[PDB]
Amino acid sequence: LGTENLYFQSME
Amino acid sequence: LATAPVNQIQETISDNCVVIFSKTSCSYCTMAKKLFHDMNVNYKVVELDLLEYGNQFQDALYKMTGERTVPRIFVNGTFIGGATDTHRLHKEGKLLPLVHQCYL
Amino acid sequence: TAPVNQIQETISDNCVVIFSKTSCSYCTMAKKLFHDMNVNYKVVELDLLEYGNQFQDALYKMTGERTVPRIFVNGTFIGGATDTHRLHKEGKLLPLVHQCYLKKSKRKEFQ
Ligand SMILES: N[C@@H](CCC(=O)N[C@@H](CS)C(=O)NCC(=O)O)C(=O)O
Ligand SMILES: N[C@@H](CCC(=O)N[C@@H](CS)C(=O)NCC(=O)O)C(=O)O
Ligand code: FES
């Protein structure tokens, strides 16, 4: 959730 | 292929509801990950291009699914297809109910 | 200097050029788009080239991104897969191709 968005925001 | 780690794929897909075997360099994989992201469901990625043993996982995916392509998407321990198949499922509203079965 | 020169010649000799990789489904979709519109296109598969990395470097300098596909119509960079599909959705792709088909000389006759 926090980790997902951390990952995702760094990719996209 | 005679020595492909299908047993490892099977561990990963039994332990995780959604698994996307992926490469970082691929827009089809990116679109597949974004779909699960946007659905706000938990998903695991396996970035085969970043892994020393990525080629072994690809041999296993070929053995199990008959294509050596990415992405390879699993839901509830079942292979559901590539990016095209996964997006077709979602267009028909059939992806979210498959994910849901993991939690029943 | 040589990759850039070869890229320039290809985009000048062909109305539509797709700098591509054989392994890439975005590239496959860009090819299919032109095919479905009844357009002949020149494909350069960077992954089948000895110095494909240098072509990707050359294309970065020319166009602003290293990514495949890199699509040219009438010698002009129009974009990657998404940009090219959007141009078509807007009815703006066929007219560019058409103008180029009506301009491009048959070199054997002009010598
Ligand atoms: N129809 C498949 C296409 C899969 C495909 O061709 N994937 C490419 C990457 S986009 C690949 O893995 N290519 C490796 C190769 O062709 O050697 C899907 O929707 O996933
Ligand atoms: N938005 C771009 C995406 C281009 C892109 O990310 N291409 C990927 C392949 S799908 C790429 O070039 N990855 C690194 C490489 O192959 O050199 C487009 O529509 O063309
Ligand atoms: S490598 Fe381009 S879409 Fe997969």
Side-chain angles (χ1 to χ4, degrees), chain A residues 2-4 6-8 10-11, chain B residues 1-62 64-90 92-104, chain C residues 1-4 7 10-49 52 55-60 62-64 66-88 90-105 109-111:
Chain A
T3 53
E4 172 54 17
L6 195 67
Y7 165 69
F8 200 75
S10 305
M11 300 316 91
Chain B
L1 221 66
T3 60
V6 167
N7 51 359
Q8 289 192 45
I9 306 294
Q10 289 172 328
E11 286 311 315
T12 289
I13 71 176
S14 303
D15 282 353
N16 294 274
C17 180
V18 178
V19 184
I20 312 170
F21 292 87
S22 177
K23 300 181 174 185
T24 63
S25 50
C26 172
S27 296
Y28 265 30
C29 294
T30 297
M31 293 178 100
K33 295 174 269 170
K34 186 176 190 291
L35 178 53
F36 294 97
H37 174 85
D38 287 348
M39 292 165 57
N40 219 11
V41 305
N42 297 329
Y43 67 99
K44 178 171 174 69
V45 315
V46 183
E47 298 292 2
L48 293 172
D49 62 320
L50 305 185
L51 291 166
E52 182 60 7
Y53 298 93
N55 287 326
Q56 287 60 55
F57 285 136
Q58 282 205 273
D59 295 340
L61 293 163
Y62 179 51
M64 293 169 70
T65 75
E67 297 292 334
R68 198 171 191 283
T69 59
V70 289
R72 301 272 83 179
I73 304 156
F74 298 77
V75 180
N76 198 27
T78 294
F79 176 66
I80 66 153
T84 298
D85 291 317
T86 299
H87 286 86
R88 180 156 314 104
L89 281 163
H90 177 63
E92 294 199 338
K94 288 163 187 177
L95 185 58
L96 197 54
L98 293 171
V99 176
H100 184 237
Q101 295 203 294
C102 296
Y103 303 98
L104 294 178
Chain C
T1 74
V4 157
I7 293 165
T10 308
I11 75 185
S12 283
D13 276 6
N14 299 277
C15 276
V16 178
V17 182
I18 312 177
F19 295 91
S20 169
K21 296 179 180 182
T22 63
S23 43
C24 173
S25 294
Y26 265 31
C27 295
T28 300
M29 287 317 102
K31 293 165 196 182
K32 189 201 191 295
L33 177 69
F34 287 105
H35 184 267
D36 289 350
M37 289 172 57
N38 305 296
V39 175
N40 266 17
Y41 55 87
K42 171 59 172 182
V43 178
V44 177
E45 305 287 11
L46 299 180
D47 60 316
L48 304 181
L49 293 179
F55 279 68
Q56 266 190 289
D57 292 351
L59 293 156
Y60 172 81
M62 295 175 64
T63 72
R66 206 165 182 280
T67 55
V68 293
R70 303 278 80 187
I71 305 160
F72 296 75
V73 175
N74 194 41
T76 303
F77 177 68
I78 59 152
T82 303
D83 295 314
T84 298
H85 282 83
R86 172 200 49 74
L87 258 206
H88 186 49
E90 298 173 2
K92 280 154 169 169
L93 184 52
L94 183 64
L96 296 180
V97 176
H98 184 39
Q99 281 161 31
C100 185
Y101 268 46
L102 288 167
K103 270 178 193 159
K104 200 72 74 184
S105 75
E109 300 296 327
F110 292 81
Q111 288 169 6

Coordinates of all heavy atoms in Angstrom, one line a residue, chain C residues 7-60, unseen atoms left out:
Chain C
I7 N 20.8 5.9 -40.7 CA 19.4 6.3 -40.3 C 18.8 7.4 -41.2 O 17.7 7.2 -41.7 CB 19.4 6.8 -38.8 CG1 19.8 5.7 -37.8 CG2 18.1 7.4 -38.4 CD1 20.2 6.3 -36.4
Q8 N 19.6 8.4 -41.4 CA 19.1 9.5 -42.3 C 18.8 9.0 -43.7 O 17.8 9.4 -44.3 CB 20.1 10.7 -42.4 CG 20.3 11.4 -41.0
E9 N 19.7 8.1 -44.3 CA 19.4 7.6 -45.6 C 18.1 6.8 -45.7 O 17.3 6.9 -46.6 CB 20.6 6.8 -46.1
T10 N 18.0 5.9 -44.6 CA 16.8 5.0 -44.6 C 15.5 5.8 -44.5 O 14.5 5.5 -45.2 CB 16.9 4.1 -43.4 OG1 18.1 3.4 -43.3 CG2 15.8 3.0 -43.4
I11 N 15.5 6.9 -43.7 CA 14.3 7.7 -43.5 C 14.0 8.6 -44.7 O 12.9 9.0 -44.8 CB 14.3 8.4 -42.1 CG1 15.2 9.7 -42.2 CG2 14.5 7.5 -40.9 CD1 15.3 10.4 -40.8
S12 N 15.0 8.8 -45.5 CA 14.9 9.6 -46.7 C 14.4 8.7 -47.9 O 13.6 9.1 -48.8 CB 16.2 10.3 -47.1 OG 16.3 11.4 -46.3
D13 N 14.9 7.4 -47.9 CA 14.5 6.5 -49.0 C 13.2 5.8 -48.9 O 12.6 5.3 -49.9 CB 15.6 5.4 -49.1 CG 16.8 5.8 -49.9 OD1 16.9 6.9 -50.3 OD2 17.6 4.9 -50.1
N14 N 12.6 5.9 -47.7 CA 11.3 5.2 -47.3 C 10.4 6.1 -46.7 O 10.7 7.0 -45.9 CB 11.6 4.1 -46.4 CG 12.5 3.0 -46.9 OD1 12.1 2.1 -47.6 ND2 13.8 3.1 -46.6
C15 N 9.1 6.1 -47.2 CA 8.1 6.9 -46.6 C 7.9 6.6 -45.1 O 7.8 7.6 -44.3 CB 6.7 6.8 -47.4 SG 6.8 8.0 -48.8
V16 N 7.8 5.4 -44.7 CA 7.6 5.0 -43.3 C 8.7 4.1 -42.9 O 9.0 3.1 -43.6 CB 6.2 4.3 -43.1 CG1 6.1 3.8 -41.7 CG2 5.1 5.2 -43.6
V17 N 9.3 4.4 -41.8 CA 10.4 3.6 -41.2 C 10.1 3.4 -39.7 O 9.8 4.3 -38.9 CB 11.8 4.3 -41.4 CG1 12.9 3.3 -40.7 CG2 12.1 4.5 -42.8
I18 N 10.1 2.1 -39.3 CA 10.0 1.7 -37.9 C 11.3 1.1 -37.5 O 11.7 0.0 -37.9 CB 8.8 0.7 -37.8 CG1 7.5 1.1 -38.4 CG2 8.6 0.3 -36.3 CD1 6.4 0.1 -38.3
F19 N 12.0 1.8 -36.6 CA 13.2 1.3 -35.9 C 12.6 0.4 -34.7 O 11.9 0.9 -33.9 CB 14.1 2.4 -35.4 CG 14.8 3.1 -36.5 CD1 14.2 4.2 -37.1 CD2 15.9 2.6 -37.1 CE1 14.8 4.8 -38.2 CE2 16.5 3.2 -38.2 CZ 15.9 4.3 -38.7
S20 N 13.0 -0.9 -34.7 CA 12.2 -1.9 -34.0 C 13.1 -2.9 -33.3 O 14.4 -2.8 -33.4 CB 11.3 -2.6 -35.1 OG 10.7 -3.8 -34.6
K21 N 12.5 -3.8 -32.5 CA 13.1 -5.0 -32.1 C 12.1 -6.1 -32.4 O 10.9 -5.9 -32.2 CB 13.6 -5.0 -30.7 CG 14.7 -4.0 -30.4 CD 15.1 -4.0 -28.9 CE 16.3 -3.0 -28.6 NZ 16.7 -3.1 -27.2
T22 N 12.6 -7.3 -32.8 CA 11.8 -8.4 -33.2 C 11.0 -9.0 -32.0 O 10.1 -9.7 -32.1 CB 12.6 -9.6 -33.8 OG1 13.5 -10.1 -32.8 CG2 13.4 -9.1 -35.1
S23 N 11.6 -8.8 -30.8 CA 11.1 -9.3 -29.5 C 10.0 -8.4 -28.9 O 9.5 -8.9 -27.9 CB 12.2 -9.5 -28.6 OG 13.1 -8.4 -28.6
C24 N 9.7 -7.3 -29.5 CA 8.9 -6.2 -28.8 C 7.5 -6.1 -29.4 O 7.3 -5.8 -30.6 CB 9.6 -4.9 -28.9 SG 8.6 -3.5 -28.3
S25 N 6.5 -6.3 -28.5 CA 5.1 -6.3 -28.9 C 4.6 -4.9 -29.2 O 3.7 -4.7 -30.1 CB 4.1 -7.0 -27.9 OG 4.4 -8.4 -27.9
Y26 N 5.1 -3.8 -28.6 CA 4.8 -2.4 -29.1 C 5.2 -2.2 -30.5 O 4.5 -1.6 -31.3 CB 5.5 -1.4 -28.2 CG 4.6 -0.8 -27.1 CD1 3.5 -1.6 -26.5 CD2 4.7 0.5 -26.6 CE1 2.7 -1.1 -25.5 CE2 3.9 1.0 -25.6 CZ 2.9 0.2 -25.1 OH 2.1 0.7 -24.1
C27 N 6.4 -2.8 -30.9 CA 6.9 -2.7 -32.3 C 6.0 -3.5 -33.2 O 5.6 -3.0 -34.3 CB 8.3 -3.2 -32.4 SG 9.5 -2.1 -31.5
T28 N 5.6 -4.7 -32.8 CA 4.7 -5.5 -33.5 C 3.3 -4.8 -33.8 O 2.8 -4.8 -34.9 CB 4.4 -6.9 -32.9 OG1 5.7 -7.5 -32.7 CG2 3.4 -7.7 -33.7
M29 N 2.8 -4.1 -32.8 CA 1.6 -3.4 -32.9 C 1.7 -2.2 -33.9 O 0.8 -1.8 -34.6 CB 1.1 -2.9 -31.5 CG 0.5 -4.0 -30.6 SD -0.6 -5.2 -31.5 CE 0.4 -6.6 -31.7
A30 N 2.9 -1.5 -33.8 CA 3.1 -0.4 -34.8 C 3.2 -0.9 -36.2 O 2.6 -0.3 -37.1 CB 4.4 0.4 -34.4
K31 N 3.9 -2.0 -36.4 CA 3.9 -2.7 -37.7 C 2.4 -3.0 -38.2 O 2.1 -2.7 -39.3 CB 4.7 -4.0 -37.7 CG 6.2 -3.8 -37.5 CD 6.8 -5.1 -37.1 CE 8.2 -5.0 -36.5 NZ 8.8 -6.3 -36.2
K32 N 1.7 -3.6 -37.3 CA 0.3 -4.0 -37.6 C -0.6 -2.8 -38.0 O -1.4 -2.9 -38.9 CB -0.3 -4.7 -36.4 CG -1.7 -5.4 -36.6 CD -2.4 -5.6 -35.3 CE -3.6 -6.5 -35.4 NZ -4.7 -5.9 -36.2
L33 N -0.4 -1.7 -37.3 CA -1.1 -0.5 -37.6 C -0.9 -0.1 -39.0 O -1.9 0.2 -39.7 CB -0.7 0.6 -36.6 CG -1.3 2.0 -36.8 CD1 -2.8 2.1 -36.5 CD2 -0.5 3.0 -36.0
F34 N 0.3 0.0 -39.4 CA 0.6 0.4 -40.8 C 0.1 -0.6 -41.8 O -0.5 -0.3 -42.8 CB 2.1 0.7 -41.0 CG 2.5 2.0 -40.4 CD1 3.3 2.0 -39.3 CD2 2.1 3.2 -41.0 CE1 3.6 3.3 -38.7 CE2 2.5 4.4 -40.4 CZ 3.2 4.4 -39.3
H35 N 0.3 -1.9 -41.5 CA -0.2 -3.0 -42.3 C -1.7 -2.9 -42.5 O -2.2 -2.9 -43.6 CB 0.2 -4.4 -41.7 CG -0.3 -5.5 -42.5 ND1 -1.5 -6.2 -42.3 CD2 0.3 -6.2 -43.5 CE1 -1.6 -7.2 -43.2 NE2 -0.5 -7.2 -43.9
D36 N -2.5 -2.7 -41.4 CA -3.9 -2.6 -41.5 C -4.4 -1.3 -42.3 O -5.5 -1.4 -42.8 CB -4.5 -2.5 -40.1 CG -4.5 -3.9 -39.4 OD1 -4.1 -5.0 -40.0 OD2 -4.7 -4.0 -38.1
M37 N -3.6 -0.3 -42.3 CA -3.9 0.9 -43.1 C -3.4 0.8 -44.5 O -3.4 1.7 -45.3 CB -3.1 2.1 -42.5 CG -3.6 2.7 -41.2 SD -2.4 3.9 -40.6 CE -2.3 5.1 -42.0
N38 N -2.9 -0.4 -44.9 CA -2.4 -0.7 -46.3 C -1.2 0.2 -46.7 O -1.1 0.7 -47.8 CB -3.6 -0.5 -47.3 CG -4.8 -1.4 -46.9 OD1 -4.6 -2.6 -46.9 ND2 -5.9 -0.8 -46.5
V39 N -0.3 0.3 -45.7 CA 0.9 1.1 -45.9 C 2.1 0.2 -45.9 O 2.2 -0.7 -45.1 CB 1.1 2.2 -44.8 CG1 2.4 3.0 -44.9 CG2 -0.2 3.1 -44.8
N40 N 3.0 0.4 -46.9 CA 4.3 -0.3 -47.0 C 5.2 0.5 -46.0 O 5.3 1.7 -46.0 CB 4.8 -0.3 -48.4 CG 4.5 -1.5 -49.1 OD1 3.6 -2.3 -48.7 ND2 5.3 -1.8 -50.2
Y41 N 5.9 -0.3 -45.2 CA 6.9 0.3 -44.3 C 8.2 -0.4 -44.3 O 8.3 -1.6 -44.5 CB 6.3 0.4 -42.9 CG 5.8 -0.9 -42.4 CD1 6.7 -1.8 -41.7 CD2 4.5 -1.3 -42.7 CE1 6.3 -3.0 -41.3 CE2 4.1 -2.6 -42.3 CZ 5.0 -3.4 -41.6 OH 4.5 -4.7 -41.2
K42 N 9.3 0.3 -44.0 CA 10.6 -0.3 -43.8 C 10.9 -0.5 -42.4 O 10.7 0.4 -41.5 CB 11.6 0.7 -44.4 CG 13.1 0.4 -44.1 CD 13.5 -0.9 -44.7 CE 15.0 -1.2 -44.6 NZ 15.4 -2.4 -45.3
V43 N 11.2 -1.8 -42.0 CA 11.5 -2.1 -40.6 C 13.0 -2.2 -40.4 O 13.7 -3.0 -41.2 CB 10.8 -3.3 -40.1 CG1 11.3 -3.6 -38.7 CG2 9.3 -3.2 -40.2
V44 N 13.6 -1.6 -39.4 CA 15.0 -1.9 -39.1 C 15.0 -2.5 -37.7 O 14.7 -1.8 -36.7 CB 15.9 -0.6 -39.1 CG1 17.3 -0.8 -38.6 CG2 15.9 0.1 -40.4
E45 N 15.3 -3.8 -37.6 CA 15.4 -4.5 -36.3 C 16.7 -4.3 -35.7 O 17.7 -5.0 -36.0 CB 15.1 -6.0 -36.5 CG 13.7 -6.3 -37.2 CD 12.5 -6.1 -36.3 OE1 12.6 -5.4 -35.3 OE2 11.4 -6.5 -36.7
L46 N 16.8 -3.4 -34.7 CA 18.0 -3.1 -34.0 C 18.6 -4.2 -33.3 O 19.9 -4.3 -33.1 CB 17.7 -1.9 -33.0 CG 17.2 -0.6 -33.5 CD1 16.9 0.4 -32.5 CD2 18.1 0.0 -34.6
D47 N 17.8 -5.2 -32.9 CA 18.3 -6.4 -32.2 C 19.0 -7.4 -33.2 O 19.8 -8.2 -32.7 CB 17.3 -7.1 -31.4 CG 16.1 -7.6 -32.2 OD1 15.6 -6.8 -33.0 OD2 15.6 -8.7 -31.9
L48 N 18.8 -7.3 -34.5 CA 19.5 -8.1 -35.5 C 20.7 -7.4 -36.0 O 21.5 -8.1 -36.8 CB 18.5 -8.5 -36.6 CG 17.2 -9.2 -36.2 CD1 16.4 -9.6 -37.4 CD2 17.5 -10.4 -35.3
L49 N 21.0 -6.2 -35.6 CA 22.1 -5.4 -36.1 C 23.3 -5.6 -35.2 O 23.2 -5.6 -33.9 CB 21.8 -3.9 -36.2 CG 20.8 -3.5 -37.2 CD1 20.6 -2.0 -37.1 CD2 21.3 -3.9 -38.6
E50 N 24.5 -5.8 -35.8 CA 25.8 -5.9 -35.0 C 25.9 -4.7 -34.0 O 26.0 -4.9 -32.8 CB 27.0 -5.9 -36.0
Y51 N 25.8 -3.5 -34.6 CA 25.9 -2.3 -33.7 C 24.6 -1.6 -33.4 O 24.4 -0.4 -33.5 CB 26.9 -1.3 -34.5
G52 N 23.6 -2.4 -33.0 CA 22.3 -1.9 -32.6 C 22.2 -0.9 -31.5 O 21.4 0.0 -31.4
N53 N 23.1 -1.1 -30.5 CA 23.3 -0.2 -29.4 C 23.6 1.2 -29.9 O 23.1 2.2 -29.4 CB 24.3 -0.7 -28.4
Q54 N 24.5 1.3 -30.9 CA 24.9 2.6 -31.5 C 23.7 3.3 -32.2 O 23.6 4.5 -32.2 CB 26.1 2.4 -32.4
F55 N 22.9 2.5 -32.9 CA 21.7 3.0 -33.6 C 20.8 3.5 -32.5 O 20.3 4.7 -32.7 CB 21.1 2.0 -34.5 CG 21.7 1.8 -35.8 CD1 23.0 1.3 -35.9 CD2 21.1 2.2 -37.0 CE1 23.7 1.2 -37.2 CE2 21.7 2.1 -38.2 CZ 23.0 1.6 -38.3
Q56 N 20.6 2.8 -31.4 CA 19.7 3.3 -30.3 C 20.3 4.6 -29.7 O 19.5 5.5 -29.3 CB 19.5 2.2 -29.2 CG 18.2 1.4 -29.4 CD 17.8 0.5 -28.3 OE1 18.4 -0.5 -28.0 NE2 16.7 0.9 -27.6
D57 N 21.6 4.7 -29.6 CA 22.3 5.9 -29.1 C 22.0 7.1 -30.2 O 21.7 8.2 -29.8 CB 23.8 5.7 -29.0 CG 24.1 4.8 -27.8 OD1 23.2 4.5 -27.0 OD2 25.3 4.5 -27.7
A58 N 22.2 6.7 -31.4 CA 21.9 7.7 -32.5 C 20.5 8.2 -32.4 O 20.2 9.4 -32.5 CB 22.3 7.2 -33.9
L59 N 19.6 7.3 -32.2 CA 18.1 7.6 -32.2 C 17.8 8.5 -31.0 O 16.9 9.3 -31.0 CB 17.2 6.4 -32.4 CG 17.4 5.7 -33.7 CD1 17.0 4.2 -33.7 CD2 16.5 6.5 -34.8
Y60 N 18.5 8.2 -29.8 CA 18.3 9.0 -28.6 C 18.6 10.5 -28.9 O 17.8 11.4 -28.5 CB 19.1 8.5 -27.5 CG 19.1 9.4 -26.3 CD1 18.0 9.4 -25.4 CD2 20.1 10.4 -26.0 CE1 18.0 10.3 -24.3 CE2 20.1 11.2 -25.0 CZ 19.0 11.2 -24.1 OH 19.0 12.0 -23.0

